[PDB]
């Protein structure tokens, strides 16, 4: 799960949209696969085909989230001509939130997902720029 | 060449158990003022052959077993652990000379109860299951007392090698320093093989009643081979003979006579006493045999230390 | 190799005898029987005493396993410590037996 | 890493002692009593050097001296030794107690023809001293230099400066 | 005390015999003078090789030969 | 249960934990863990209810799986290191196996599922014994092996435990499940700081033990198992309601009470290592623990729920329960902030 | 916490079984006595960090004695190359590797 | 490492996966747990006897006995379950969901 | 093919585990565990552990699995796709490991495993006039005082616990 | 009788053991030369 983030981050910002979109789609698909595995383990489906349908639904939803976020972030960083800016990732996060609202067939979830996912993606880009660490090595 | 040795070990076992059935009938009959079989052959010598041919051509029962795998497998394990268990016997030289022959025999003794358990489970009658459970409990309890008695006697001996028991008994028998252990060992081996007065399935059901004539015959062969070998084990363990390395036939004749006398003593005990109850034999083990076994185990742990009588490891 | 050969010989003689006993009168021609014990309709009720003596056997068997290597252990150089530990093991076995005796553990299967 | 230093096949060539185990066990006590010095020197060299390749010449001396034992058996006491080792060789465990009269005859012939005294109980199992010319290996394990330990703690314990210095706590 | 002992000898001889045997086993090694003989019998068994010591120059107690008078003796085990 | 047998079983539990604490051999650690499990099984079966049997069965199965994984880790470290000394492990796979084994033993998420289950089905004294004493030995084993602990795994377990404990305690009405989820969140707090400064882990362990002891002692003294009887407590004795309000205030980390002491110190050891996102996230999540503590204080002491007519009879009888160390544990858990540097005795 | 009761009280409970080069019955040595002895006498009293960064050579030697990765890797290489040259016909086994050596003793 | 180490580790792994997926019974899970203990026994004694660790040969017997004692405890719990719902099915142990 | 005997035995060992990891029935699971225990005893027999192999036969099979089957006979009253499915799956993966490590002689899953026989790692020395494992077990009383004390106390406590919790009162 | 025979057995055992430790050095030297010869043969085969 470390090589997927590495292959997403080694692509420079706003250079090749296809590779970034594919990497973000793979990361989203892995997250959706984990979520679907935990859902079918903790809550047993009434049939095998129901379980496969739920797994496919979760995987496709999260893959669409990742693909839309990566595509929108790379296109906005290309057209706005600045690669090191968290506003591009904020726009991509709101696009992902709108994709979540389109997947869940509601508007309020879409608006809240736009706001919070845009904030989270901007925070992720800010941490990548400033070198913030969440799993910090013990140095003191 | 070695397979010839294996066959000359295993075929006389079957001959000995068939003529043990004959000897049991004759000796039991003569002890209650009548005769045994003396019509079929000269003094009934052809009786086991006639019984075998009769039992192998009878119609099989074909019971409605829940499982056929356990039904087949119980005679397999019974006969295999009856015949494998003869190989480390030093008569005066064993077939397989092993460092831990006593532990091997104890392991197969513990392992032999699965035939009873699978025979009880495979039969569809639950009363047979209850009888099998009681027989299993009796066998494992007397397994415990057999293990402790064997441990104390081997602590006198000093090693687990079965052939060393001939060397350690060159001067005097081990029934002289260990006669309470000898008595309790004899009763424990009597109760191990479901021998009178410790059999329960004959009195008020059996676990192997549902088996056909052939499988019942195979169970009988396994049980009687166990009886003969247990008597031979008691003879080797407590009543060892004089062994000459240049004439092994002296030791062979001597321990054969002793084990024959012990088997006749088994049949003699069968025709003297009424049957025990199940709770009465549990009371005999857990409240009478076990405290004395633990006390004599402590005594035989401490006795070679305080007497400068520790035997060699080799 | 000798022990494996003896085990295989005993096993193959056993299955040959079982196959002969189970199949030789099967080739004879007879008449079949209908599919039909005092407790056929009644379920089997649980008894705590048999399970109790089973677990008592298991625990005494484990302490027997602990007590077993005494013939090898008697040849040591710390004879006082070996004697003390052996006597302590058998004393704890007897203490377990007496505590099972006092608390009505060996009841109706005594 | 390194290349293993191995002696050539000419360094490993010696006249063997081609006798069976019962032949050796028959004359084991007299071999221990008479051939003690090269055996003890070889065993001390083996336990000090911890390397067979450094002891080979000493081993050759054993394969010489033991042979000089057996020839003296062959010259003078061939037949009682033959009977004794045959009697030892018959039994499965090679027990000494089954061959007492042949051992007595062999020992009598050896004593009155060569003056060898059989050792008593515990005599061969003694620990002896060996005077040898080869020096003691100062580094038999080929150990390198140990790492330097950390500096220890020294000096008197002064009180802590301005107390705990934990946030607003003065002490 | 004597009435109780005769009472348990009347009702439960098996427990009385077992307790007597256990008490004898637990108090007899501390009184028999043969335990030390067991200790030095177990000590005198040569399981390993008696590896010789290098002669520094001053070891009068250690022998130079197996048949030398120095070292431990085993006449007590020969006689007992 | 006989008093002598109960005393012997309790000293067996204590002996097992002490054996885990004082031994330098991995086999003795395993032996002490089995001693602890085997001796604590009957305490959960003190009442002989079907719920107690099911709780004991679930606890037995989880502890058996944890002990088997621990033995696998010990055997792998034996193969790859050739020694048994309780110190850093010499294989990452053995370290991972041992870490998840001790996480299953401590009830860390996502192995937490037995903790709200089991604590519901056992009496209050046995639940207190579980949630306080059973957490000493695995924390000692985690203390000894921190050079080989993977940082990613332990921090993931810590944040999962804190989040799941808060979101689980947000829903319950029963007191024992609330204490179970609070325990899960607190062990997330204690394991989040382990690789930076284990003295703070010791301090948080001690403070959590004192607080859980005080709350369970108050519940045993008032004989309350749901929130409605705790609401009823205002009529029978108001001082008990004041004490549970103050203790629940302290359990949420509200200053100047002593529950602010551990977590704040934990932050002081994680901003030193330039980790700022994680302590802020953990405080934001512990606000949910403060929320359901506030809900309990609203139900118990800050208002007066209606009582029944038979409660008047309970006005005529003084309580006779041996409230052992209740005032001492109430004082020590709430006014211990001005003696904060005393944690230096644990360094 | 690790309460060192044994070192405070001077008693020995499990230190005899911790390591492999300890005192053994009848002085029976293990197969990696020297390697573990050298590693232990290196890493004594210098701490875990200096132990893991200073004498990694001794620990690698001890691990190689314990598991024999490189030894059977070399054996695999030798046997594979021997089988390949046997198939290619450029190599034959000597008589002393075929069973007619009339060995040393 | 050797081949038998791979085989014993795979045996432990399949017994662990057998334990973690309950089918219908509890006796089957108990048997899976004892299979895990047996694989641990075999791995430990193979490692011990390979390296000639003399004293450590006392260890696996303890590894048997303690764990075997635990097995007895587990059986008793199963019997208690069998005394309540009449069967050892795991789908009756759900009284603590609420 | 004889020199791989232990390895061959090990195959049956893991095969026996798929006998009861699929969990067909407690009787058949017990039979599979019995076969696995016998195979493991043979495996440790081929390494020189005779006393430990007879410990496996005497205490595991004849002592504990007897009680397991004895309690099995008091449940699972006498009279699937999933059992056969996971049996086939486990057998297929097991033979995949066998084929791969017999093909390229060096595989890895978590650790690097070698494809040679078990005979290579054996010792070339002789133990003398004693069995090293035998005296290692015999040192339980001379050296393992603390281990004996804690094991005996554990067994006594286990007896007390067992007869206490099944009283029901 | 058992104590007398066991003491005699101990004396015979230590006699056999002292015979073995007298025979040890020759077998040790033979084993060293044999393993060196085997290693040399393996070295030559690895070379060719």
Q: For this experimental structure, what is the resolution in angstroms?
A: 3.2
DSSP string of B16-32? HHHHHHHHHHHHHHHTT
Q: Do D49 and J19 contact (CB within 8 A), yes or no? A: no
Q: Where are the alpha helices (DSSP H) in chain D?
A: 21-26, 28-34, 36-49, 56-76, 78-90, 100-114
Establish how many alpha carbons lie within 13 A of residue G8's alpha carbon, considering only the half-sphere containing its beta carbon. 6
- Tell me whether D127 touches chain F (CB under 8 Å): no
CATH number at residue C74: 1.20.58.1610
Give the phi and the psi of residue E23 in degrees, each rounded to 5. -65, -40
| CA pair distance H32, H26, nearest whole angstrom | 10
Residue A57: CB atoms within 10 Å? 13
**Tokens read off for C42:** 């009644």
Collapsing DSSP states into helix, strand and coil, what is residue C32?
Answer: coil
| Max Cα–Cα distance, chain F, nearest Å | 71
Collapsing DSSP states into helix, strand and coil, what is residue H98?
Answer: coil
- Give the single-character DSSP code of J1: -
Residues from chain H that touch F176, judged by Cβ atoms under 8 A, are none
Closest CA to F38 of I164, I60, C90: I164
Token match 């002989």: residue?
F48
Residue H95: CB atoms within 10 Å? 16
Closest CA to I74 of C35, H78, G50, C44: C44
Token match 């299967």: residue?
C109
| Those residues with Cβ within 8 angstroms of residue F6's Cβ, 6 or more apart along the chain or in another chain | none
| CA pair distance A79, A83, nearest whole angstrom | 10
**Tokens read off for H54:** 């003399």
| CA pair distance F86, F74, nearest whole angstrom | 10
Give the phi and the psi of residue B267 in degrees, each rounded to 5. -65, -35
The domain in which residue F200 lies consists of: 1-347
Q: Do E17 and B295 contact (CB within 8 A), yes or no? A: yes
Give the phi and the psi of residue F225 in degrees, each rounded to 5. -125, -20
Residues from chain G that touch I143, judged by Cβ atoms under 8 A, are 16-17, 25
Residues from chain I that touch H15, judged by Cβ atoms under 8 A, are 17, 20-21
**Tokens read off for B236:** 């080797």
Residues from chain B that touch C8, judged by Cβ atoms under 8 A, are none
Interface of G with E in 14-33 (CB under 8 A): 26-27
Q: Where are the alpha helices (DSSP H) in F23-49?
A: 26-44
Collapsing DSSP states into helix, strand and coil, what is residue H40?
Answer: helix
J48 CA: distance to closest CA in chain D (Å): 16
CA-CA distances (angstroms) from residue J8 to B168, E48, F12, F35?
Answer: 11, 21, 48, 47
Token match 């050579």: residue?
G57
| Those residues with Cβ within 8 angstroms of residue B48's Cβ, 6 or more apart along the chain or in another chain | B18, B19, B21, B22
| CA pair distance F235, D140, nearest whole angstrom | 85
The domain in which residue C65 lies consists of: 1-103
| CA pair distance B250, B92, nearest whole angstrom | 9
- Give the single-character DSSP code of B244: B
CATH number at residue H64: 1.10.287.3510
Give the phi and the psi of residue J15 in degrees, each rounded to 5. -65, -45
C-alpha A95: how far from chain center: 10
Q: Taking CA F235 as the corner, what is the angle to CA F234 and CA F240, rounded to the nearest 5 degrees?
A: 40
End-to-end CA, chain J: 67
Contact state of B83 with C13 under an 8 Å Cβ cutoff: yes
Experimental method: cryo-EM
Residue C72: CB atoms within 10 Å? 24
β-pairing, I106-108 vs I112-114, is antiparallel
Closest CA to B289 of B196, B215, B192, B171: B192
Residues from chain B that touch E18, judged by Cβ atoms under 8 A, are 291-292, 294-295
- Give the single-character DSSP code of D116: P
CA-CA distances (angstroms) from residue H67 to F33, H26, I147?
Answer: 11, 17, 15
CA-CA distances (angstroms) from residue A29 to A23, A37, C79, D19, E6?
Answer: 10, 12, 69, 77, 87
F126 CA: distance to closest CA in chain I (Å): 15
**The dihedral of CA A11, A17, A19, A23: what is its sign?**
positive
Collapsing DSSP states into helix, strand and coil, what is residue D129?
Answer: strand
Q: Is residue H92 part of a domain?
A: no
3-state secondary structure chain I: CCCCHHHHHHHHHHHHHHHHHCCCCHHHHHHHHHHHHHHHHHHHHCCCCHHHHHHHHHHHHHHHHHHHHHHHCCCCCCCCHHHHHHHHHHHHHHHHHHHHHHHCCEEECCCEEECCCHHHHCCCCCCCCCCHHHHHHHHHHHCCHHHHHHHHHHHHHHHHHHHHHCCCC
Interface of G with I in 18-57 (CB under 8 A): 25-26, 28, 31
Least CB-CB distance to J43: which of D6, D28, D122? D6
| CA pair distance G80, G90, nearest whole angstrom | 14
**Tokens read off for F290:** 């403060």
Closest CA to E19 of I35, D117, B292: B292
- Tell me whether D90 touches chain B (CB under 8 Å): yes
| CA pair distance B239, B256, nearest whole angstrom | 11
The continuous run of DSSP H or E covering G9 comes out as helix G5-9
The domain in which residue I143 lies consists of: 4-166
Contact state of C37 with B298 under an 8 Å Cβ cutoff: no
**Binding partners of C (≥3 Cβ pairs within 8 A):** B, E, H, I
| CA pair distance D109, D97, nearest whole angstrom | 19
Conformational region of residue B230, where left means phi above 0, alpha means psi within -120 to 50, and beta covers everything else? alpha
Residue of C nearest to E15 (CA): C98
Closest CA to D48 of D119, D140, D147: D140
**Tokens read off for E45:** 């068994």
Give, to the nearest 10 degrees, the angle between helix C48-67 and helix B126-157: 20
Q: Do B226 and B233 contact (CB within 8 A), yes or no? A: no
Burial class (CB in 10 A: 0-12, 13-18, 19+), B31: middle
Going from N- to C-terminal start, the domains of chain D cover: 1-137
Conformational region of residue B308, where left means phi above 0, alpha means psi within -120 to 50, and beta covers everything else? left
Closest CA to C106 of C26, C66, C49: C49
CATH number at residue I107: 1.20.120.1200
The continuous run of DSSP H or E covering J24 comes out as helix J2-47
- Give the single-character DSSP code of D19: -
| CA pair distance H42, I52, nearest whole angstrom | 10
DSSP string of G88-99? HTS----GGGTT
Closest CA to I52 of B109, F70, H5, H46: H46
| CA pair distance G79, G94, nearest whole angstrom | 15
The continuous run of DSSP H or E covering D130 comes out as strand D129-130
Residues from chain G that touch F345, judged by Cβ atoms under 8 A, are none
3-state secondary structure F292-347: HHHHHHHHHCCCCCCCCCHHHHHHHCCCCCCCCCHHHHHHHCCCCHHHHHHHHHHC
User: For residue D116, is the peptide bond before it cis, meaning its omega torsion is within 30 degrees of 0?
Assistant: no
**In 3-state terms, chain G is what percent helix, strand and coil (to 5)?**
55, 0, 45
| CA pair distance F158, I109, nearest whole angstrom | 29
Q: Do F47 and F34 contact (CB within 8 A), yes or no? A: no
User: For residue F329, is the peptide bond before it cis, meaning its omega torsion is within 30 degrees of 0?
Assistant: no
Least CB-CB distance to I124: which of J17, J20, J35? J35
Closest CA to B293 of I40, H90, E17, F113: E17
How many domains in chain C? Answer: 1
| CA pair distance F202, F196, nearest whole angstrom | 12
- C-alpha dihedral, C70 to C71 to C76 to C78, nearest 10°: 30
- Tell me whether I128 touches chain E (CB under 8 Å): yes
User: For residue B252, is the peptide bond before it cis, meaning its omega torsion is within 30 degrees of 0?
Assistant: no
DSSP string of G26-40? GGPPPTTHHHHHHHH
| Those residues with Cβ within 8 angstroms of residue F279's Cβ, 6 or more apart along the chain or in another chain | F266, F267, F270, F271
**Tokens read off for D59:** 């081993």
Q: Do A36 and A58 contact (CB within 8 A), yes or no? A: yes
| CA pair distance A87, A77, nearest whole angstrom | 9
Residue G48: CB atoms within 10 Å? 12
Q: Do H35 and I36 contact (CB within 8 A), yes or no? A: yes
Q: Which residues have a C–N gap over 2.5 Å right after them in chain A?
A: none
| CA pair distance J34, H89, nearest whole angstrom | 65
Q: Which residues have a C–N gap over 2.5 Å right after them in chain E?
A: none
**Tokens read off for F292:** 């359901």
Give, to the nearest 10 degrees, the angle between helix B47-55 and helix B213-238: 140
Residue B108: CB atoms within 10 Å? 18
- Give the single-character DSSP code of G59: H
3-state secondary structure F167-236: HHHCCCCEHHHHHHHHHHHHHHHHHHCCCCCHHHHHHHHHHHHHHHHHHHHHHHHHCCCEHHHHHHHHHH
| CA pair distance F46, F57, nearest whole angstrom | 14
| CA pair distance A45, A29, nearest whole angstrom | 21
The domain in which residue H23 lies consists of: 1-86
Interface of I with F in 86-105 (CB under 8 A): none
């Amino acid at each position: 799960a470390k090589t997927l983030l590495h292959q997403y981050w080694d692509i420079p910002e706003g250079t090749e949209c296809h590779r970034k979109t594919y990497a973000a789609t793979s990361i989203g698909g892995a997250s959706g696969l984990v979520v679907s595995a935990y859902s079918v383990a903790l809550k047993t489906p009434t049939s095998f085909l129901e379980g496969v349908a739920r797994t496919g639904r979760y995987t496709f939803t999260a893959a669409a989230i990742g693909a839309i976020f990566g595509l929108t972030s790379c296109i906005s960083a290309q057209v706005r001509e600045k690669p090191d800016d968290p506003l591009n990732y904020l726009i991509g996060g709101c696009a992902g939130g709108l994709t979540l609202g389109a997947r869940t067939r509601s508007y309020g979830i879409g608006a809240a997902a736009c706001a919070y996912m845009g904030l989270t993606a901007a925070l992720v880009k800010m941490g990548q720029l400033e070198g913030w660490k969440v799993f910090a090595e013990p140095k003191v | 060449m070695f397979m010839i040795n294996v066959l000359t070990l295993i075929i006389p076992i079957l001959l000995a158990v068939a003529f043990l059935t004959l000897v049991e009938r004759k000796v039991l009959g003569y002890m209650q003022f009548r005769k045994g079989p003396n019509v079929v052959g000269p003094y009934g010598l052809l009786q086991p052959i006639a019984d075998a041919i009769k039992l192998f051509i009878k119609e099989p029962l074909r019971p409605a077993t829940s499982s056929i795998s356990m039904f087949i497998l119980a005679p397999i394990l019974a006969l295999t652990l009856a015949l494998t268990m003869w190989i480390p016997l030093p008569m005066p030289y064993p077939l397989i000379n092993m460092n831990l022959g006593v532990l091997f025999m104890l392991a197969m003794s513990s392992l032999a109860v699965y035939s009873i358990l699978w025979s009880g489970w495979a039969s569809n009658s639950k009363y047979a299951l209850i009888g099998a459970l009681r027989a299993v409990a009796q066998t494992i309890s007397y397994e415990v007392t057999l293990a402790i008695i064997l441990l104390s006697v081997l602590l006198m001996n000093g090693s687990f090698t079965l052939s060393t028991l001939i060397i350690t008994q060159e001067q005097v028998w081990l029934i002289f320093p260990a006669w309470p252990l000898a008595m309790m060992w004899f009763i424990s081996t009597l109760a191990e093989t479901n021998r009178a007065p410790f059999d329960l399935t004959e009195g008020e059901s059996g676990f192997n009643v549902e088996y056909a004539a052939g499988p019942f015959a195979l169970f009988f062969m396994a049980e009687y081979a166990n009886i003969i070998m247990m008597n031979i084990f008691t003879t080797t363990l407590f009543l060892g003979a004089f062994h000459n390395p240049y004439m092994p036939e002296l030791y062979t004749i001597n321990f054969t006579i002793k084990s024959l006398l012990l088997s006749i003593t088994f049949l003699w005990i069968r025709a003297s006493y009424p049957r025990f109850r199940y709770d009465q034999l549990m009371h005999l083990l857990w409240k009478n045999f076990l405290p004395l076994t633990l006390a004599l185990c402590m005594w035989h742990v401490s006795l070679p230390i305080l007497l400068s009588s520790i035997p060699p490891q080799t | 190799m000798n022990l494996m050969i003896t085990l295989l010989t005993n096993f193959t003689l056993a299955t040959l005898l079982v196959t002969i006993a189970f199949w030789l009168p099967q080739l004879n021609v007879y008449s079949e029987k209908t599919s039909p014990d005092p407790m056929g309709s009644a379920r089997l009720p649980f008894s705590m005493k048999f399970f109790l003596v089973a677990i008592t056997f298991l625990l005494f068997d484990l302490e027997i396993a602990l007590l077993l290597p005494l013939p090898w252990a008697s040849q040591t150089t710390n004879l006082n410590t070996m004697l003390t530990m052996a006597l302590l093991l058998i004393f704890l076995l007897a203490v377990s037996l007496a505590y099972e005796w006092t608390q009505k553990g060996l009841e109706w299967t005594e | 890493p390194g290349i293993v230093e191995l002696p050539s096949l000419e360094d490993l060539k010696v006249q063997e002692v081609k006798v069976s185990s019962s032949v050796l066990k028959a004359a084991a006590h007299h071999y221990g009593a008479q051939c003690d010095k090269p055996n003890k020197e070889f065993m001390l060299c083996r336990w000090e050097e911890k390397d067979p390749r450094r002891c080979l010449e000493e081993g050759k001396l054993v394969n010489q001296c033991a042979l000089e034992f057996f020839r003296q058996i062959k010259r003078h006491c061939a037949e009682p030794f033959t009977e004794y080792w045959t009697c030892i060789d018959y039994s499965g465990l090679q027990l000494f107690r089954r061959c007492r009269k042949e051992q007595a005859q062999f020992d009598k012939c050896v004593l009155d023809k060569l003056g060898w005294v059989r050792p008593d109980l515990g005599e061969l199992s003694k620990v002896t001293k060996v005077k040898t010319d080869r020096p003691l290996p100062e580094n038999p394990y080929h150990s390198r230099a140990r790492p330097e330990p950390n500096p220890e703690v020294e000096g008197d314990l002064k009180p802590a400066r301005h107390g705990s210095r934990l946030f607003f706590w003065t002490m | 005390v004597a009435a109780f002992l005769k009472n348990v000898w009347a009702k439960e001889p098996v427990l009385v015999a077992s307790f007597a045997i256990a008490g004898l086993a637990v108090i007899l090694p501390t009184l028999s003078p043969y335990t030390k003989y067991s200790l030095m019998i177990n000590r005198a068994t040569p399981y390993n090789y008696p590896v010789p010591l290098r002669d520094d120059g001053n070891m009068p107690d250690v022998p130079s030969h197996p048949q030398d008078p120095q070292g431990p003796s085993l006449e007590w085990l020969k006689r007992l | 249960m006989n008093p002598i047998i109960l005393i012997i079983i309790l000293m067996t539990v204590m002996l097992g934990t002490i054996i885990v604490m004082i031994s330098t051999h991995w086999l003795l650690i395993w032996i002490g863990f089995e001693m602890n499990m085997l001796a604590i099984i009957p305490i959960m079966m003190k009442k002989h209810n079907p719920r107690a049997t099911e709780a004991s069965t679930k606890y037995f199965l989880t502890q058996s799986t944890a002990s088997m994984l621990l033995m696998m880790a010990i055997i792998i470290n034996l193969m790859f290191s050739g020694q048994w000394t309780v110190m850093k492990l010499f294989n990452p796979m053995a370290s991972m196996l041992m870490t998840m084994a001790l996480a299953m033993k401590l009830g860390m998420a996502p192995f937490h599922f037995w903790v709200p289950e089991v604590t519901q089905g056992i009496p209050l004294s046995s639940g207190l014994i579980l949630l306080t004493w059973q957490k000493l030995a695995p924390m000692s084993v985690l203390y000894q092996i921190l050079p080989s602990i993977n940082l990613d795994l332990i921090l993931t377990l810590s944040i999962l435990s804190i989040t799941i404990g808060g979101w689980g305690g947000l829903n319950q009405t029963q007191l024992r499940k609330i204490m179970a989820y609070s325990s899960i969140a607190h062990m997330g707090w204690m394991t989040a700081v382990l690789l930076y400064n284990p003295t703070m882990t010791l301090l948080n362990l001690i403070i959590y033990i004192i607080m859980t002891s005080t709350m369970f002692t108050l519940f045993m003294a008032n004989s309350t198992t749901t929130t409605l009887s705790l609401s009823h407590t205002w009529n029978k004795a108001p001082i008990m309601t004041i004490l549970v309000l103050i203790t629940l205030l302290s359990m949420g980390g509200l200053p100047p009470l002593s529950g602010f002491m551990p977590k704040w110190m934990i932050i002081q050891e994680m901003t030193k290592n330039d980790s700022i996102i994680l302590p802020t996230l953990m405080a934001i999540t512990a606000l949910l623990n403060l929320y359901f503590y506030m809900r309990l204080t609203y139900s118990t002491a800050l208002t007066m729920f209606p009582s029944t007519n038979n409660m008047k009879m309970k006005w005529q009888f003084p309580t006779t329960k041996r409230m052992t160390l209740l005032p001492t544990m109430t004082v020590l858990s709430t006014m211990l902030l001005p003696l904060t540097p005393i944690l230096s005795i644990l360094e | 916490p690790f309460f060192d009761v044994q070192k405070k009280l001077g008693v020995d409970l499990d230190h005899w079984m911790t390591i492999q080069s300890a005192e053994q019955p009848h002085r029976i040595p293990a197969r990696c006595h020297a390697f573990e002895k050298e590693w232990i006498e290196c890493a004594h009293g210098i701490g875990s960090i200096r132990a893991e960064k200073e004498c990694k050579i001794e620990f690698e030697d001890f691990r190689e004695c314990l598991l024999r990765q490189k030894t059977m890797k070399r054996l695999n290489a030798i046997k594979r190359q021997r089988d390949k040259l046997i198939k290619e016909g450029k190599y034959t086994p000597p008589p002393h590797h075929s069973g007619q050596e009339d060995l040393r003793p | 490492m050797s081949l038998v180490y791979m085989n014993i580790m795979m045996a432990f792994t399949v017994s662990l996966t057998g334990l973690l997926m309950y089918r219908s019974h509890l006796m089957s899970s108990l048997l899976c747990l004892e299979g895990m203990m047996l694989s641990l026994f075999i791995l430990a004694t193979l490692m011990i006897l390979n390296s000639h660790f003399t004293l450590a040969s006392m260890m696996p017997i303890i590894l048997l006995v303690f764990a075997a004692c635990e097995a007895a405890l587990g059986l008793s719990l199963l019997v208690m379950v069998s005394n309540t719902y009449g069967t050892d099915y795991v789908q009756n142990l759900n009284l603590l969901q609420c | 093919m004889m020199t791989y005997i232990v390895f061959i035995l090990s195959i049956i060992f893991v095969m026996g585990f798929v006998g009861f990891s699929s969990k067909p029935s407690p009787i058949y699971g017990g039979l599979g565990l019995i076969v696995s225990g016998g195979v493991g005893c043979g495996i440790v027999l081929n390494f020189g552990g005779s006393f430990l192999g007879l410990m496996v036969f005497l205490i595991y099979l004849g002592g504990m699995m007897v009680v397991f089957g004895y309690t099995t006979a008091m449940a699972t009253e006498q009279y699937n796709k999933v059992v056969l499915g996971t049996f086939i799956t486990g057998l297929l993966m097991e033979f995949l490991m066998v084929y791969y490590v017999l093909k390229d002689k060096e595989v890895e899953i978590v650790f690097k495993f070698n494809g040679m026989g078990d005979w290579v790692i054996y010792d070339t020395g002789d133990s003398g006039f004693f069995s090293e494992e035998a005296m290692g077990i015999a040192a339980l009383y001379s050296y393992g005082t603390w281990l004996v004390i804690v094991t005996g106390w554990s067994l006594l406590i286990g007896v007390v616990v067992i007869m206490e919790i099944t009283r029901g009162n | 009788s058992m104590m007398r025979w066991n003491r005699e057995r101990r004396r015979l055992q230590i006699e056999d053991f002292e015979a073995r430790i007298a025979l040890m050095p020759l077998l040790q030297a033979e084993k060293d030369r044999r393993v060196l010869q085997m290693l040399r043969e393996n070295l030559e085969e690895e070379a060719t």
